[PDB]
Design a binder for this molecule. Sequence first.
Ligand SMILES: [Zn+2]
Length: 454
Amino acid sequence: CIDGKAKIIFENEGEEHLTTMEEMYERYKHLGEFYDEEYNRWGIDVSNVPIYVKSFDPESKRVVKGKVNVIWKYELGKDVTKYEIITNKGTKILTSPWHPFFVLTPDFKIVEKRADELKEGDILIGGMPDGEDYKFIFDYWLAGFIAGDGCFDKYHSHVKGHEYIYDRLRIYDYRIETFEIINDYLEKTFGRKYSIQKDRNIYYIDIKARNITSHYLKLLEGIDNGIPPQILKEGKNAVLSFIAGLFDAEGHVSNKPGIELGMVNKRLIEDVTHYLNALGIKARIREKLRKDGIDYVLHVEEYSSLLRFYELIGKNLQNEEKREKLEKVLSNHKGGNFGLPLNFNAFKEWASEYGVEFKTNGSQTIAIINDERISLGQWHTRNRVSKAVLVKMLRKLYEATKDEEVKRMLHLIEGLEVVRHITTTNEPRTFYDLTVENYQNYLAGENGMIFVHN
Ligand SMILES: [Zn+2]
């Protein structure tokens, strides 16, 4: 069982939701909750209600859809010490002493260890990519772009015989190219196009067509409390297209390298951050002290995550200037130095099955794949290797073999997180848990997503 503030993503009839554990319980309470007198816990049978979460299958080592049968609510007191676990990524997990986590050992074996057995430096199995295909939908991109550079208001004609009040949508951008793409879409989708206006360095279109304004007003309804439900309920393709539009509008690519997306809409930024993490992209939020307030900035700096960000969102960016910069900072990456404690000989055994040859140059390790030489840092001598270096080698190994087992290893590595801090407490805490059929674990967490076991 874990703290009620942990975020979780789940679906019904293909309809996805993103809420905290508390809210998930509150949402199905009407179905009637029963009290388990023996275990002093409250439950709710949702076995008949199709509820699915993201589950990890230790066997095939991939992410699968897990069936939830019961949602539990617990009241833990001072008789039990709670364990707070924080990873390098900032991911937070407050749980019970016996609650087990999936741990990757140096020998590349997955084992379960309870929260009280964990120690700084342990490798936890966290949110990871599913490798599936994703489709770009322009309609949702435009909704995301409007969310960032659009403005809705009321236009009063005030003309005699035509005194009506219409909804007006004005979209702004510093590039005229953006509007040529939008007009092309608007013309074919709504049979309407707009002359591109200019007002001192800034371009914009003024839209008053009832069918277009209402179409987008309805898609963005609820943006104040997070990702709009109309979008979110539609799944990955809609949400990802939406984020891309959001990034095109306000996203920034730095030379760290990395990407940043800041807005004053805390709830929206939080939701996007948790949604990206659930897809294997290690994003985090940072607060930027501003003039009259605070800006919530989503950050992605992990090389492997940036690369993944590029494949799911980056390549679909409409602003060719940001897209190109991202590709450049990516093809020129120095290297994330944080080394994962993994044994080289164990990896060597596994990789030999593919014909991978290994050479050494002093303390440096080198892998040979298709005549190409790839540096693996000082792996064979330190039994430590950086996620970035290992991700680069595995992408090469997959490109040369097209073998699903390799792809699976790659995704596993991309999702890894490392325990940085572990604290305790005995304060009033109401925890929740989910009984997942077969897999017995689901994806959830605060400022990150990690696979928690039943
Ligand atoms: Zn008026």
